[PDB]
Amino acid sequence: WQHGEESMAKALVACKIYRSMAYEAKQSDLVDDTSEELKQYSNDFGQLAVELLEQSFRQDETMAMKLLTYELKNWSNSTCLKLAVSSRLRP
Amino acid sequence: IENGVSMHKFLTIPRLEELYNTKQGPTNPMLFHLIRDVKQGNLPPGYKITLIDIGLVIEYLMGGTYRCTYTRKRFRLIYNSL
Amino acid sequence: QKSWIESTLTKRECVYIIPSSKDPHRCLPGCQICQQLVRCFCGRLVKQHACFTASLAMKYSDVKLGEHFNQAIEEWSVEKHTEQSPTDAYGVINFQGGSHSYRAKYVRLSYDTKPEIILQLLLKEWQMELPKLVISVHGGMQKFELHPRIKQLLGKGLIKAAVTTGAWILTGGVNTGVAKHVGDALKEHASRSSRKICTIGIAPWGVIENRNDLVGRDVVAPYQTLLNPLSKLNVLNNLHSHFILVDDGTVGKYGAEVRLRRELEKTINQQRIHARIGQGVPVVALIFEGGPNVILTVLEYLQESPPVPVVVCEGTGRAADLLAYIHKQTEEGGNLPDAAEPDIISTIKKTFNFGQSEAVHLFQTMMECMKKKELITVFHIGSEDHQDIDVAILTALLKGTNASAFDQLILTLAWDRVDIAKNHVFVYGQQWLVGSLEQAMLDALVMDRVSFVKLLIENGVSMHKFLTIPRLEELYNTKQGPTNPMLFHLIRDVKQGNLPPGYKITLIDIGLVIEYLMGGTYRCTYTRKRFRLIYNSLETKRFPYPLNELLIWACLMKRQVMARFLWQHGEESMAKALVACKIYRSMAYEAKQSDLVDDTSEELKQYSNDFGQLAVELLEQSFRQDETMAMKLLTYELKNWSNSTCLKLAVSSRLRPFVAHTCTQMLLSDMWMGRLNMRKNSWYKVILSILVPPAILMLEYKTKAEMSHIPQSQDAHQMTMELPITRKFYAFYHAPIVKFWFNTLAYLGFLMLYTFVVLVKMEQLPSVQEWIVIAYIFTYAIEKVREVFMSEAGKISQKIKVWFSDYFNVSDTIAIISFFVGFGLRFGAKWNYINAYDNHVFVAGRLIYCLNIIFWYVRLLDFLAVNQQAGPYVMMIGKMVANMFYIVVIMALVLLSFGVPRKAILYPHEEPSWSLAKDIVFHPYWMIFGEVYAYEIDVCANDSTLPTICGPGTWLTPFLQAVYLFVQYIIMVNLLIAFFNQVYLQVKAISNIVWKYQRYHFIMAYHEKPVLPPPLIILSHIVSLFCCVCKGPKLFLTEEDQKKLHDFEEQCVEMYFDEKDDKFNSGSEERIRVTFERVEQMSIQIKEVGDRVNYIKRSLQSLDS
Amino acid sequence: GDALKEHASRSSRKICTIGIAPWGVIENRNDLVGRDVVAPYQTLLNPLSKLNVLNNLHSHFILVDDGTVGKYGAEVRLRRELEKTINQQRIH
Ligand SMILES: CCCCCCCC/C=C/CCCCCCCC(=O)O[C@@H](COC(=O)CCCCCCCCCCCCCCC)COP(=O)([O-])OCC[N+](C)(C)C
Ligand SMILES: CCCCCCCC/C=C/CCCCCCCC(=O)O[C@@H](COC(=O)CCCCCCCCCCCCCCC)COP(=O)([O-])OCC[N+](C)(C)C
Ligand SMILES: CCCCCCCC/C=C/CCCCCCCC(=O)O[C@@H](COC(=O)CCCCCCCCCCCCCCC)COP(=O)([O-])OCC[N+](C)(C)C
Ligand SMILES: CCCCCCCC/C=C/CCCCCCCC(=O)O[C@@H](COC(=O)CCCCCCCCCCCCCCC)COP(=O)([O-])OCC[N+](C)(C)C
Ligand SMILES: CCCCCCCC/C=C/CCCCCCCC(=O)O[C@@H](COC(=O)CCCCCCCCCCCCCCC)COP(=O)([O-])OCC[N+](C)(C)C
Ligand SMILES: CCCCCCCC/C=C\CCCCCCCC(=O)O[C@@H](COC(=O)CCCCCCCCCCCCCCC)COP(=O)([O-])OCC[N+](C)(C)C
Ligand SMILES: CCCCCCCC/C=C\CCCCCCCC(=O)O[C@@H](COC(=O)CCCCCCCCCCCCCCC)COP(=O)([O-])OCC[N+](C)(C)C
Ligand SMILES: CCCCCCCC/C=C\CCCCCCCC(=O)O[C@@H](COC(=O)CCCCCCCCCCCCCCC)COP(=O)([O-])OCC[N+](C)(C)C
Ligand SMILES: CCCCCCCC/C=C\CCCCCCCC(=O)O[C@@H](COC(=O)CCCCCCCCCCCCCCC)COP(=O)([O-])OCC[N+](C)(C)C
Ligand SMILES: N#Cc1ccc(COC[C@H]2O[C@@H](n3c(NCc4ccc(Cl)c(Cl)c4)nc4c(N)ncnc43)[C@H](O)[C@@H]2O)cc1
Ligand SMILES: C[C@@H]1CC[C@@]2(OC1)O[C@H]1C[C@H]3[C@@H]4CC=C5C[C@@H](OCCC(CO)CO)CC[C@]5(C)[C@H]4CC[C@]3(C)[C@H]1[C@@H]2C
Ligand SMILES: CC(C)CCC[C@@H](C)[C@H]1CC[C@H]2[C@@H]3CC=C4C[C@@H](O)CC[C@]4(C)[C@H]3CC[C@]12C
């Protein structure tokens, strides 16, 4: 994650994937859920985005609002904010 | 990657494709479950995971309308060509 | 063309052909394998030279048929056999595979290009600022090898000198040379990713690896990290930012460093270091192990004009060692000690593997190198010889290059670094020019370099001497610093719209701003008739107290770090900090209102509450020494700040924590007393002594000694200048506590009569009581008018804006205006003479009385809040009524959610009526208070008070009401409880502070109130009126006491700093920091001994044997 | 003074240094003329300055005027007597 680019975007995709695997694990069980293992893995990425944002909001609040809205084009023409709302990432 | 190994150079279809098809690591045994779901029950003997498949999982995990690059008409072509 | 790069720059390349070494190797017929292999002297394979005109000659073999004077070719003229064209290789490297992918950028030009073009695109196209240093590292370029300390430490400097001066390190580019080595430092340090060093590293396009990857116009490059073991072509080094790839027009060849790396150096040294300063940008040449060519290159910079110095290093390799070696042998430069003049040539041999004719040639270069040992230095990492190559680099430009200490200093000023000048310019026995110190302070102030202000004011630069009208006047008229762009806004406002073209700010103007920012009546020195004269005339042109004038400048132009520095110096420290808190607090309000871009208001509001907190923290440091003098500090007329007071400024800035300190409250008590010593006396005695005048003569007053810290009016000072019986009354009646308990007992005799009138019937004419009632209000109203006109504020529109920002002065206005609607309709009426309450006019005027009364019982909270326990609880009922408006609206939806269905379900025949506006709101409100109307639920029941309301649907209301009260008595009314219980400390803490602050405006209103209460006050009005047509406090000190107080402030400031410095140095967190940093250093200085001791042992094991 | 500043005595009623000297070898004598008068005495580190500044950190001074510029001697006539005269007084 730290390598490459589009760091905020990637972290919020991960928070969705882990959050989405956890829900499927609970539902479709076979042995130990590993769900709280995943829910911890989501809320780790999903907390980097929050902590990456504040580090950008404190520099230039204007551009840090453009980050939440530019079409990503490597992530299905979605948006760094429409992914958070998809993951119910309230913070 | 420090001493110099560009991921851009070391990331083909065949390389990437088998990185899913390995048990030689801390594998998630759940990935094979999500796949056999999106196939609607189908489950061949060995089942080489194809990148069509990983796409349809992400389209299913990310929900809504998230289309991965792995499912678009372009990528479907080239995957059936190599 | 759309690209200034190729629109301006061009690429050179071979266009003719010149076979390089015609003779084919093997493969018996030459013709094909000859041409296929035999490169042009152009460069690359002869066949590769496409450039069509050449390619219609490559067709057979070349240009100039075969032999055809094979000797004639053999030059490849780089203008005729070589034409240039617009660039097609200029883009941005990405360094494919780089661990966070450090970036750079490239162009590709022709070496005949002039440096004007390279400079302008560098600072326009590539968009940089001119540096403040150019570290051109003309060292040895052979991927060489070092020891960790010098691999590690040497970078600790080199990086640091370049980040602290925004340098442009100018290497050779290639990753097999001096470039390779700085990168080892650039990464070991990482510069905490930023706009760090903006390294250039110019190299050619000829010896470069993967040239074809980064071809194309303004194109990203997949440039790859090829550490292929052989790779005759070389990679650019990683960490280097911006590149230039000057294409000579030939692969393989060299030379595209010096044609520009010469010109660039001189051309940057031709430009001005800064707007204010007028020197040339410095060039410094660093050497990592050099070479036969470098050791001459070293010499060239020694021989240039300007004499660009050099820095070499003991222990990087051959050249840097030898130049450092002969620096030991050669003394004075001119010597060469002749005992070893080829003995170095013995060393010149072994290090390089040179010969003989070049051995003296190297030795020759060594001589002219030494002929000026002045402007060249050495880095002896093995010893304590000017550590941390920084100092050496930064210093070396000053020692060698002949320049006055001014010309030295002003450079150090540009480089925001005192530590150099503190130890290398401000050194012993120096020739300091008379006005250079002054002229430097002009530059350090405008450029916001506090550290040099400190330096100069230490070494001796009196602000009293360096502060004229013209100097000060332009310090506002500068853009060369962190300017506030708002100052020009406040000026164009106070000019009432006027805005000339350039508008030299005059000191008239700054005055009118401060008069506008500080408000009230604050007259600055800049506007008084005296100063207006002298300004229109130009040591009398100086200011007495400069640091009172710069502290304004540092704050108007938003230069906080300057402001605090200029605050600790000078005198009147408490006063200055509270002016600043007002100015910043006043600019913030004007920023919000008059916006243009980012408010900067929270930036200012933080700047105010910083000063405004020093005053509070400076006070407590003075209250804990001598509580008496610390109350005199709050009251002495300042005389440099418009005859104002250290407390009247806090009140102006609404700085609650100061007025609510325990010194601003013990003074206010001491004025509340007056000439009374109410710690001995008791409130019983005052109430008695009012209704018993001759009991005043048994009250124990205070001596003129015990009223030194208490500001007085002129008259009370006189009664203590000129206790007798007659002065023993005057001191009672003119006491604030007495004026209070002499109004309360009147007001509490007003509310006992008014209450009597309101309750008892009211005949045609007012009874004796009601006349006395009107008398109070009328005479009270007059007291409220004169309270306005004789208020502190200036323009009436501002007097009519502070007196209406008060809950009880509005409530008086509503209650004095209303009672005279009441007295108007009560006295002015026809009075039916049969029964009152048959004239609705009369009725009306009463119900005005019986309701106005609520304004007058509620006012006893103005009296009851005098107490230190009751005040807060009165100042909470505002902050609980305010912060629950939103629960209480939620409690009114539920009320109508229930009241509308019930009145619809129960009374289903109602024509439109106003009763449908009460009965949907009436009973559902009295339910909140526990009235369930239990015999009206289930109206069809047998126990009902409403047996006629029984009808279809009326079985639903018991359910609706069940749901209702569960919300209005269990959910919502217990949400209030939980609201108050959790907002109690944080409103009780405040409401104390809002109370202790409002105690000021209350006491200081009785201290200007008439003695005589609002029934008899009319006498004291007529006295003042009659005589003012015919005929505030001050802390009167003697000139001796002004000094003793002045001494008190001085010491108390000095302690505030001396204590906090120790509270920081004594803290654990700080001792861990030092301990840590020592123990790091200790590890080093031990292990080196541990090494050395291990050499003194292996020695003595073998010396004697 | 180099010591008095390196330590700073954590500003207080610290050492009350006297440092008696004359009015003859003194620099900017004219700045501090007048009865009970504040002095704009200035920090002149002019490189030559045959006349010399009083050192900074020194508190109370005495400037015994022999009645002659340039001359010396207005140390010992009092710096003798003072020493003995304080040594004549009771310590407590
Ligand atoms: C510090 C600032 C805040 C305080 C503000 C202070 C100013 C206060 C502001 C006041 C403004 C409020 C309005 C004025 C009051 C009267 C209005 C009214 O209705 O009058 C009535 C009486 O009119 C008469 O002329 C007969 C009674 C004498 C008038 C006494 C009221 C004026 C006193 C003012 C002393 C104020 C000065 C106090 C000393 C400074 C008119 O109606 P009517 O005639 O009854 O109707 C007859 C109808 N019928 C025939 C059918 C029956
Ligand atoms: C017989 C009886 C008949 C009457 C019975 C009915 C009585 C009805 C009961 C009425 C309630 C009366 C008490 C409320 C007082 C206001 C509270 C207050 O001061 O708030 C704020 C004033 O804020 C301001 O900006 C100042 C100007 C506002 C004036 C408000 C007028 C209300 C008039 C209502 C007309 C009602 C008239 C109804 C009758 C015609 C507090 O201060 P601030 O916000 O800091 O001030 C700005 C200062 N600053 C800019 C420096 C920050
Ligand atoms: C259906 C019934 C519904 C309820 C009816 C209404 C009842 C409720 C009352 C309504 C009166 C209207 C005024 C509301 C107050 C507004 C201001 C405020 O909230 O606080 C502000 C001041 O507050 C004050 O100065 C007064 C606070 C209100 C006291 C209420 C009277 C209590 C006694 C009545 C006895 C009557 C008994 C007899 C009755 C016949 C302070 O707010 P803040 O957060 O500090 O803001 C900063 C202020 N600043 C700008 C100055 C810096
Ligand atoms: C800023 C903050 C806002 C404050 C709150 C909002 C303001 C308050 C708003 C209130 C609504 C308005 C009510 C009055 C409407 C007119 C009534 C009328 O003309 O006649 C009525 C008479 O009875 C009365 O006039 C009594 C007074 C009204 C009751 C007030 C209830 C207050 C408690 C609740 C307050 C909580 C409010 C909850 C929120 C909704 C009835 O009709 P009638 O036929 O004439 O009477 C029978 C006579 N007969 C038998 C002889 C025939
Ligand atoms: C919980 C433990 C306690 C026991 C539980 C036992 C449960 C068994 C309940 C059974 C209810 C059915 C039997 C009653 C009908 C008989 C006819 C009758 O009397 O009609 C009456 C209507 O009265 C009603 O309709 C009564 C209310 C019915 C709904 C009950 C609540 C739903 C269950 C709970 C869920 C609630 C949701 C909660 C939401 C948060 C009409 O007669 P009247 O009143 O005389 O008016 C007519 C007069 N007139 C003709 C002159 C105009
Ligand atoms: C504006 C401020 C002024 C300053 C105030 C002082 C100046 C005011 C001074 C005097 C005013 C009165 C003088 C005029 C004549 C009075 C006649 C009268 O009412 O007699 C009644 C007493 O009095 C009352 O019942 C009303 C007055 C006294 C009680 C209320 C005010 C007391 C507070 C103020 C003083 C203490 C303060 C305490 C708190 C600190 C008695 O008669 P009655 O009740 O009708 O019954 C008799 C029996 N019979 C009917 C069967 C025959
Ligand atoms: C009247 C104008 C109304 C316009 C608004 C003015 C607002 C108030 C202005 C000014 C301030 C108050 C003074 C004027 C009002 C009170 C006096 C008064 O009017 O007495 C009336 C006489 O009534 C009596 O003789 C018996 C009761 C009152 C006398 C005691 C006065 C109390 C105030 C003293 C202590 C406070 C002062 C202390 C300073 C030393 C005369 O008025 P009238 O209407 O002719 O009376 C009816 C007819 N009658 C005479 C046959 C009985
Ligand atoms: C400066 C501000 C001024 C305020 C406004 C001034 C208002 C001045 C207004 C009027 C002055 C003149 C009075 C007469 C009016 C015409 C009606 C009339 O004559 O008689 C009618 C009275 O009908 C009513 O309604 C009387 C009461 C209305 C006044 C309400 C004022 C509210 C003030 C709010 C508080 C403000 C607080 C301000 C706070 C900041 C009927 O009576 P009649 O015919 O005479 O005889 C008996 C009838 N009968 C036979 C049927 C039994
Ligand atoms: C005429 C014959 C004589 C008798 C008449 C007079 C009787 C007495 C009058 C009033 C009753 C209360 C008296 C207590 C005063 C004690 C002294 C005191 O400390 O006062 C304090 C409050 O000062 C005040 O004035 C508080 C408000 C009282 C006057 C307004 C009426 C409110 C009470 C009625 C409301 C309606 C309730 C209805 C209930 C039925 C001030 O001082 P402190 O807080 O101690 O200051 C602390 C710091 N220090 C001490 C270092 C300075
Ligand atoms: N000593 C002393 C002293 C004497 C009297 C007072 C009473 O307060 C007077 C002023 O106190 C002001 N004030 C008040 N007054 C409180 C209040 C006033 C009236 C009522 Cl009925 C109630 Cl329920 C409460 N609250 C304030 C606040 N939250 N912020 C700023 N100012 C406030 C108000 O303008 C009022 O005019 C306060 C202190
Ligand atoms: C958001 C909130 C939604 C609910 C609500 O507030 C806002 O919406 C308001 C609309 C109001 C009605 C509008 C008009 C009239 C006509 C009038 O006709 C007099 C006729 C005759 C008398 O005899 C003249 O002589 C009688 C009163 C009535 C019905 C109002 C009652 C209160 C109502 C229902 C209010 C209610 C509290
Ligand atoms: C709607 C009209 C016609 C009828 C009367 C309305 C009621 C609600 C009015 C009449 C008198 C008013 C009071 C008069 C004075 C005050 C003192 C003030 O400090 C707080 C509000 C308070 C306590 C008012 C609250 C509202 C009030 C009680």
Swiss-Prot record, chain A:
Oligomer status and interactors: Homodimer. Homotetramer. Forms heteromers with TRPM6; heteromeric channels are functionally different from the homomeric channels. Interacts with PLCB1.
Q: Which domain of life is it from?
A: Eukaryota
PTM notes: Autophosphorylated; autophosphorylation regulates TRPM7 kinase activity towards its substrates. The C-terminal kinase domain can be cleaved from the channel segment in a cell-type-specific fashion. TRPM7 is cleaved by caspase-8, dissociating the kinase from the ion-conducting pore. The cleaved kinase fragments (M7CKs) can translocate to the cell nucleus and binds chromatin-remodeling complex proteins in a Zn(2+)-dependent manner to ultimately phosphorylate specific Ser/Thr residues of histones.
According to UniProt, the tissues expressing it are described as:
Found to be expressed in brain and skeletal muscle, with stronger signals in kidney, heart, liver and spleen.
The entry sums up its family as follows: In the C-terminal section; belongs to the protein kinase superfamily. Alpha-type protein kinase family. ALPK subfamily.
| Protein name as catalogued | Transient receptor potential cation channel subfamily M member 7
Q: Which residues of the full protein are shown?
A: 642 to 732 of 1863
Gene responsible for this protein = Trpm7
Q: What does this protein do?
A: Bifunctional protein that combines an ion channel with an intrinsic kinase domain, enabling it to modulate cellular functions either by conducting ions through the pore or by phosphorylating downstream proteins via its kinase domain. The channel is highly permeable to divalent cations, specifically calcium (Ca2+), magnesium (Mg2+) and zinc (Zn2+) and mediates their influx.
Give the disruption phenotype, in one or two sentences: Inactivation of Trpm7 in mice results in early embryonic death (6.5-7.5 days). Mice die as a result of trophoblast defects and consequent failure of implantation. Tissue-specific null mutants shown defects in cardiac and renal morphogenesis, organismal Zn(2+), Mg(2+), and Ca(2+) homeostasis and thrombopoiesis.
Localisation: Cell membrane; Cytoplasmic vesicle membrane
